[PDB]
């Protein structure tokens, strides 16, 4: 279960670089130089890194300082063979974004948010990023009167449309991916789930330029089934990027290493990504717990990748098992994949076997055999066949 760059594993600079500051606690680790993170991640078998503008260049840097930071980062990438497949903008840390970036009530803040984003899109393209993520963590409200949501969605659409106009005007191939989250740090965050983001994207002027970057923990913070959400995103052709970590149910965003939290959901996620042939980065957005020192940080990062590879093996074994294939037929998964009425509406209406002569009792009596199928899945996950 040793990862290599061919496995496409990526990490945010802000993940392994998390200093351990939480709402009730000060930092437990010193800041990392992005250069050292690139080196350490490469040694572990990572394929690349991702960044917020403010992770790579200290906020407020001069053009000269900016150039020097990028120069050192570029050298680390060249020294290691590491890539930068995705970037994003920090529109949440600075107090100016306390009511949002793109949907701040203050118009001047919204304009600044767009300019800050655009500047980093240029840099992202320069560093080779194919995906530009937006997490609207400050977009929302703690109280009902503070945010007219229809107005806010108008502003959100305007922002994304402008960003699409910009990339098109520069001939960039980069695409956007919205990363949903239901709450935290706002009481309620706009576009709170994969569903809400997907629906919003359909109203953008150039919908083809936008997808989702769903995070395991975030959908789980709404008690939702992450594999189900990913399936809907795939069904819509919008899984542009994936965001991997762990979470124990409905509480604050834990960002545990991937495999931690809901282990069986991680199994079914890997099963789906591999079955669907998802070809993008396998990106980790996780926090090594603040209990850890730097050795613990790298152990937690290594664990992300190891757990993906273990689950990939077990899912593949599950699907390849002739006994499982038989169980899938017993549970009529084959029938699920067949059209309900390829014969058409009129034929359906005229088909007495569909209603007038349908034996509902005989159909009802047929067990689905899902428990046997699921215990085969459990046995495969646990290596207990
Ligand atoms: Zn690649
Ligand atoms: Zn500096
Ligand atoms: Zn998270
Ligand atoms: Zn994330």
DSSP string, 135-183: --TT-EESSGGG--HHHHHHHHHHHHHHHHHHHHHTT---EEEE---SS
CA 216 to chain centre: 7
Among the bound ligands, name the one nearest to the CA of residue 253. Answer: 3
Pairing between β-strand 188-189 and β-strand 140-141 as defined by DSSP bridges? antiparallel
Residues around ligand 3, an ion, CB closer than 5 A? 217, 253, 255
Q: Is 285 annotated as a binding residue?
A: yes
CB of 288 closer than 8 Å to CB of 255: no
Give the integer Cα–Cα distance in Å for 55 and 19.
12
DSSP single-letter state for residue 127: T
Residues 6+ apart with CB under 8 A from 189: 136, 137, 139, 140, 180, 181, 182, 183
User: What HEC string does 19-72 produce?
Assistant: CCCECCECCCCCCCCHHHHHHHHHHHCCCEEEEEHHHHCCCCCCHHHHHHHHHH
Is 99 assigned a ligand-binding role in the annotation?
no
CA distance 213 to 197: 10
Q: Relative to the alpha carbon of 247, which ligand is closest?
A: 3
Residue by residue, DSSP assigns 241-306 as -EEE-B--SSSS---BPBTBS-HHHHHHHHHHHHHHT--S-EEE-----TT--HHHHHHHHHHHHH
Using the mean position of ligand 4's atoms as its centre, give its distance from the Cα of residue 52 in Å.
Answer: 12
218 marked ligand binding residue: yes
CB atoms within 10 A of CB 141: 19
Provide the annotated active-site residues: 52, 55
Q: How far is the CA of 322 from the centre of ligand 3 (A)?
A: 38
Distance CA 378, CA 358 (A): 36
CA distance 169 to 357: 61
CA of 150 to the centre of ligand 2 (A): 41
Report how far ligand 2's centroid is from the alpha carbon of 129 (Å). 23
Which numeric CATH code is attached to 1-385?
3.20.20.150
What lies within 8 Å, CB to CB, of 319 at 6+ separation is 271, 275, 325
Angle made by CA atoms 45, 49, 54, in degrees to the nearest 5: 150
How far does the chain reach from its first CA to its final CA, in angstroms? 20
Question: Which ligand is the nearest neighbour of the Cα of 254?
Answer: 3
The answer to whether residues 153 and 190 touch, using CB atoms and an 8 Å cutoff, is yes
Ligand closest to the CA atom of residue 221: 3
Q: How close is the Cα of 179 to the center of ligand 4, in Å?
A: 7
* Integer Cα distance of 360 and 369 in angstroms: 18
What approach was used to elucidate this structure?
A: X-ray
Distance 286 CA to ligand 3 centre (A): 7
Do 362 and 353 meet the contact criterion of CB atoms below 8 Å apart? no
Residue 292 is assigned to a ligand binding site = no
Separation CA 27–CA 5 (nearest Å): 31
Flag whether 255 is marked binding: yes
Domain layout of the chain by residue ranges = 1-385
Question: Residue 268, Cα to own-chain centre: how many angstroms?
Answer: 15
């Amino acid at each position: 279960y040793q990862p290599t760059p061919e496995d496409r594993f990526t990490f945010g600079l802000w993940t392994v670089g998390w200093e351990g500051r939480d709402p009730f606690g000060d930092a437990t680790r010193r800041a990392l130089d992005p250069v050292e993170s690139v080196r350490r991640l490469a040694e572990l078998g990572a394929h690349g890194v991702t960044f917020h503008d403010d992770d790579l260049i200290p906020f407020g840097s001069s053009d000269s300082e900016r150039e020097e930071h990028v120069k050192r980062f570029r050298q680390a990438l060249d020294d290691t063979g590491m890539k930068v497949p995705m970037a994003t903008t920090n529109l949440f840390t600075h107090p100016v974004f306390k009511d949002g970036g793109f949907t701040a009530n203050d118009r001047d803040v919204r304009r600044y948010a767009l300019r800050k984003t655009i500047r980093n899109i240029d840099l992202a393209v320069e560093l080779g990023a194919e995906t530009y993520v937006a997490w609207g963590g400050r977009e929302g409200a703690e109280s009902g009167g503070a945010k007219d949501v229809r107005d806010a969605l108008d502003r959100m659409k305007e922002a994304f449309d402008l960003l699409g106009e910009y990339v098109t005007s520069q001939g960039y191939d980069i695409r956007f991916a919205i990363e949903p989250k239901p709450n935290e740090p706002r009481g309620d965050i706009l576009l709170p789930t994969v569903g809400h983001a997907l629906a919003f994207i359909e109203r953008l002027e150039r919908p083809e330029l936008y997808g989702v970057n769903p995070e395991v923990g975030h959908e789980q913070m709404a008690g939702l089934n992450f594999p189900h959400g990913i399936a809907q995103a795939l069904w819509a052709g919008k899984l542009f990027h994936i965001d991997l970590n762990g979470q124990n149910g409905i509480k604050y965003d834990q960002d545990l290493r991937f495999g931690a939290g809901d282990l069986r959901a991680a199994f079914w996620l890997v099963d789906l990504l591999e079955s669907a042939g998802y070809s993008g980065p396998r990106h980790f957005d996780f926090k090594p717990p603040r209990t850890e020192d730097f050795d613990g940080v790298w152990a937690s990062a290594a664990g992300c990748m190891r757990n993906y590879l273990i689950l990939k093996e077990r899912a593949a074994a599950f699907r390849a098992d002739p006994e499982v294939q038989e169980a899938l037929r017993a549970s009529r998964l084959d029938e699920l994949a067949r059209p309900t009425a390829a014969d058409g509406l009129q034929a359906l209406l005229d088909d007495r076997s569909a209603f007038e002569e349908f034996d509902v009792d005989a159909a009802a009596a047929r067990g689905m055999a899902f428990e046997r199928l699921d215990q085969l899945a459990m046995d495969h996950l646990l290596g207990a066949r």
